[PDB]
Symmetry: D2
Subunit: 157 residues, 4 copies
């Protein structure tokens, strides 16, 4: 019976490792806090160095982004998200995230992503897909590669 085990949890910053966004990039780091397989939701911190244009992605659900530090923007919009701002991406929209400056502080963002991230080509083809399964595979692959007993980010406990 699952409800007997469900309760308010807390995962401290240094109880989940920072890890490279493999096999695509070694500079973009990610830290997984929650990976909900029922609704397909992930809660993460995402570190990225300055002056980096990232791939255009089509996202199926919503994305809440709180900028911890640094500045960034989408090539498709005329605004810049600074530290202390909140960006709310809506369903079935396309975005090309990138750094707001060629050099400066690294971009750290707290993200709550619902649904899958479908990465695209210039010719508009779907090349890669990131979801809770790919998030979990990466989290468990890094843990098993190192000597880290992995935590259950799937449950709410």
């Amino acid at each position: 019976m699952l409800f007997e085990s469900i309760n308010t949890g807390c995962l401290d910053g240094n109880d989940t490792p920072w890890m490279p966004f493999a096999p695509y990039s070694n500079d973009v780091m990610v830290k997984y806090f929650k990976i909900d397989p029922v609704r397909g939701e992930t809660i993460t911190l995402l570190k990225a160095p300055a002056g980096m244009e990232m791939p255009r992605h089509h996202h199926t659900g919503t994305v809440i982004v709180y900028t911890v530090q640094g500045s960034w923007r989408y090539k498709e919009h005329d605004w810049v998200a600074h530290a202390g701002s909140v960006v709310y991406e809506t369903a079935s929209t396309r975005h090309t995230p990138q750094s707001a400056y060629a050099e400066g502080p690294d971009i750290i963002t707290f993200n709550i992503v619902a649904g899958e991230l479908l990465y695209l080509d210039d010719k508009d083809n779907i090349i890669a897909v990131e979801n809770w399964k790919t998030s979990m595979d990466r989290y468990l692959n890094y843990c098993k590669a190192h000597g880290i007993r992995p935590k259950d980010l799937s449950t709410f406990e």
Copy 2:
């Protein structure tokens, strides 16, 4: 200011038309009740004749299915959903819906779909995508084709 206009609404069965799932099928009918563009959620009735195997789809979010009448199942699972049952599909999973019998009552289902439906080939390629945008395009295209003043399924009012 949007909250001033937000309130509990009601769309009666004969205030939204039954329409073919164009341009793919003329036999599978759909009725749109809500098309949320923020979270990418649609509420619909979906009519389908007996003995029809539908395309395999990968779904990015959740799907709550209440069977109004008829019986159906997924080729990937060993159970059959009858009238009065509730099926709860979870994020990033693949399913091939089909009729539970070659002949009998038409399958009517009340569906609450969160996210996009990525239709696939036997070779596993993404061929078609259904989302709130494609749902809205179809709803507005049928209304404009006929003499129907379309309703705002985007707002909650």
Copy 3:
């Protein structure tokens, strides 16, 4: 590890019992399909005889109501929900549901309720609260009272 057990499930109409909405009413019946303790969501069928005014309730989240049969309405609104209609109640609103006629078919409704139902007095005081915990208590109390092995409505499997 929870994600290893998460999958698309199906609960048939006669695999969850119809039960009175105890200890408040013996005429209003409820059937529980899902009782999510993480987000506080319940999926149910709710049967009610004609000509019955129910208590006014304040609801904290949303409610999607599909009318399977019968007709009903809220005293606070000028519309009537008939069979085949969809009603979408929005957050922090107050409603007094009641039958659209003094005599006629029993009202059966498919409901997806997110959050708690705070029942109120004429003097506007909170008297009763219905949530996933009270839903689960009732489901498990009826099952234990009878000889029914209860199902895990808490998990998505």
Copy 4:
């Protein structure tokens, strides 16, 4: 037609004011980023000075808390949330938030609260309720009190 206006938005830290959590406290500050009246969801930054025990509250939905700075905890749990941690509160649970130390850095937290916050007495009575309506009233009352043209936190645009 609402979907025509829906798009990815961004509210910068200094485009929404820090304001006291009136009429209850002048020391606890709040900053509103989003106030969704459909699902009853609010996105906020919440500043609180060290060594402050806050009222016990029962919450109807979920709460995602990212600690920007400082340390805090719930009296009902044995863990402490530090800067860089993520706390996920689940539906229909009771918590007494408080500072992890009598003196030290002020507690700043990024919160995503779904549903209402029902504040309680020692005798367990519901005394106060905070929701999107009370959040909006406070946001609009402070703006009108000062010479601030208020932003539409209700829409996703």
